[PDB]
Amino acid sequence: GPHSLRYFVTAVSRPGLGEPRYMEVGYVDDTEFVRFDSDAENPRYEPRARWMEQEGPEYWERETQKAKGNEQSFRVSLRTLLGYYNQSAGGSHTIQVISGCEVGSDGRLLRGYQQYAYDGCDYIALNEDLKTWTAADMAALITKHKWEQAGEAERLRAYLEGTCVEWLRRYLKNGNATLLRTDSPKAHVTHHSRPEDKVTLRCWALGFYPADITLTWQLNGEELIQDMELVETRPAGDGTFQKWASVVVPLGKEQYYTCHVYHQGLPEPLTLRW
Amino acid sequence: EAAVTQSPRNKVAVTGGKVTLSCNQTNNHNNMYWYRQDTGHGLRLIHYSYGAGSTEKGDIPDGYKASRPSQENFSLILELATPSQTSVYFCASGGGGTLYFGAGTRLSVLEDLRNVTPPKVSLFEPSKAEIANKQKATLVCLARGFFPDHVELSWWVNGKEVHSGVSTDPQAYKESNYSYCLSSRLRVSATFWHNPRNHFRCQVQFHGLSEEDKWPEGSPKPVTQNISAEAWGRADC
Amino acid sequence: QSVTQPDARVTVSEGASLQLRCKYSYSATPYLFWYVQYPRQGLQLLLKYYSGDPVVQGVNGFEAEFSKSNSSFHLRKASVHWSDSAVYFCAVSGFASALTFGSGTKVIVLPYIQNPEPAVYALKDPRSQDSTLCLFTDFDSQINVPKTMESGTFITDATVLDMKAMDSKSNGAIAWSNQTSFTCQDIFKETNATYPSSDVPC
């Protein structure tokens, strides 16, 4: 299937509070494997998935110096942004950037992207042509032209189509044995009394991995889209996930309701009846 | 284009002196660098900057300071110059990958400021032997006596700078211990030479004492200046 | 991120091919660059490598090939001429956004003189009486110009000059000595024709 390599970058200025908190988090197929936090004791890049330990001392050193460099870079952008928006000097702000590559099973780059956001708002972003940018506002124009003035697009493209893809391939090696992990949800339905002679049927999906899952309720063949509530899938805390979905049915006629759980770890879509 | 301008081009400062090298940039690049170049060491980084207000020590920061007032410029301050800092400095602006360099700045740090001296330039005319059997004429310009070797030799024919037929020593040579020499050739046909209508001039711009520098007295002030020597074409009698 | 150039000087003949060696030490793949430095100025880029195809083509017939194996980034030009004479720098970037430079390689490409006529003419300064100075010119680019073996005397290294009259390149060496006497023959003992500036009667 398709795999991706992505770094999530955050910088938040803390006026009066001192120098900005800087953080880099890397993800392979959506699983965290490296992180760097300026607000730690000895801020250095460290492995976040056990298989990343097979990388020698050099790797950690190299990425730490780089992160220390990326850190100052963003330290300056924070400031640059205050001018672009003529904003307060003592206000805290945030920059977030997502940067990475999605490549297919045939090794081709399906997607390369570097997206910026300032205070939770899209700022700039690399078009899928990996040659031009799309500014969000008039401040983003200043950077667009400036980045075009230093041919940044060309070099970002080189990383995206080469380095990123090349290092993705390398982590997949060290991580196949763990990245493929699959854990089926154990489902079940509970019954909760309601007034007006009505009832709540809650279908639960627990202990599953990865998070991608789907629950639906069925009333005589058709799946109820109406008054059906379902919570955000959530972390159990041990690497597994949980999620439930429920519907309100009249009492004495629930047995005409079936829950369906669709998870990739199941030989087949579970089917639950109260 | 990708312009980067350093100022000054040359500087004759004395130990303990104050030197400010400045870089102006129209590239609108976020990063800027200040390097020094020396033989056996290639170029080496002294200080760089990630933007206006940014400054961070390079591989050899010791003895230097920097200030990044704005995007356009990055300065290297030498609050207390030492002869060790005599060298050629270059600032570069960069956009994350490849750097663009200014044309450099020769700097000489002297332990004394009285050894400095303008050049004596004389124009040696072409032997008639050369001109006779080869129909060519090699005029030779020689510059002797200048100390801080910040000089530029140029040739002027009938008022216009000429390049074709010109070959100038690349580096200045050292005769004594506070005296440098430099020579140059200018070859033209015999016709062009015997033509008394043609005027030739060798010029040697010498970079020395700043107007804002003090000089003792009596002896003239070794301030920047051009010194020339001329010859007029002539008939072969 | 480190880089070095093992050959301080490289002297080739015009029309020959050229290779400049560059080695880098580094745990990952670095950015690689090649710059040229002409006589009295700063550096200019010839080419760079960020990632991808290991063979990159640059300005003026220049090209390099990144070899992860050999950990090298050698520069090449099939056919160089005199104007390629200059100082070439290899550079690298990894950790930081700044470039680390190699010590550099000075390239001397010998122009070839079809018909050398090695002469050592006598020239004088008409303003300074008894002002010595000998001009060694029109010799071979292969031959070797002698240097000074003491104080007081001086000779210049070869230098090339080129006239806009078809092929007109020609090497030259200038000499002078404070010595009471001793003319050109005595100083440029290894040459050829030493025409006397003795005027031709008319």
């Binding site: 970058v9 890397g26 990326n70 870079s73 952008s77 570097q114 200043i142 990123c164 | 933007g51 | 956004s97």
Partner: peptide, 8 residues
Amino acid sequence: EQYKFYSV
């Protein structure tokens, strides 16, 4: 590995 970013 990570990219070397270029300020806005």
